[PDB]
Automatic annotation (TrEMBL), chain A:
Keywords: Plasmid. This is Periplasmic divalent cation tolerance protein. It comes from Nostoc sp. (strain PCC 7120 / SAG 25.82 / UTEX 2576).
Length: 102, 104, 104
């Protein structure tokens, strides 16, 4: 499995999370409100967002990335994949994540 | 060192985080409240949880895993280990983590 | 790119995050309040902190680490780098992060 992250404006965040799960694109999404500060075209932006932390099979990462790009309201969406130590993780959990990612 | 994550109901998250630190199974736990949406046995579940981000020596990961499974209320607990770049991380911090984690 | 994490007291977290972005030492920081429980010199400590999740180019990681050590108010600052799968991540996003991180 791997973990992927995106930041979304708050309303879109909850809606898109639900859709990724309903479509079995991801097994689980954890949503955290965040304050994001970032550079964009010579401006410093300070925004209310929500972080989606998405748990998905390794094989399903491409499908997630494509669906995120279809749904994401931003011209340049965040999509960052974090490496999981699959051996050290609980094997029954990684299998669950694999099984729910259709 | 590595980082391990689990989600727990808020009734248990704070208690278990404390116990892991008191028993020197982990050096440090960060707790974040979270809304979790997940697929379970044909249903979409929407729950209040707390995420434990646990910092532990690489060698102590197995002991952590075992203790999480003993304590976790869920039939299928989340236990996901994230890869740390030990070279790029601050060595003094990695050594702190290692020193607080007791191996047996 | 990589992701780096540090925890700061809330009276410094927002200030440092803003500085790191203004100076182009990172492209983006996400800030999350956290409850930290940790082991320190035989005591269990329970603190209010803020986690900074910093997105930075791979080549700017060293400069970030140094800047964090200059600014951090703890005697032993946290700085943990988590491994990003750059190929699986969105290429346009990783290019954005690279472009907004200035080494010089």
């Amino acid at each position: 499995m791997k973990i992927a992250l995106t930041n979304l404006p708050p309303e879109h965040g909850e809606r898109i999370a639900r859709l990724l799960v309903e479509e079995h694109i991801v097994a689980c999404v954890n949503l955290y409100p965040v304050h994001s500060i970032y550079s964009w075209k010579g401006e410093v932006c300070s925004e209310a967002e929500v972080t989606l932390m998405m748990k998905v099979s390794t094989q399903g990462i491409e499908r997630l990335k494509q669906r995120i790009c279809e749904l994401h309201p931003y011209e340049l969406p965040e999509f960052v994949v974090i490496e999981v130590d699959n051996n050290a993780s609980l094997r029954e959990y990684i299998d669950f994540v694999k099984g729910e990612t259709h």
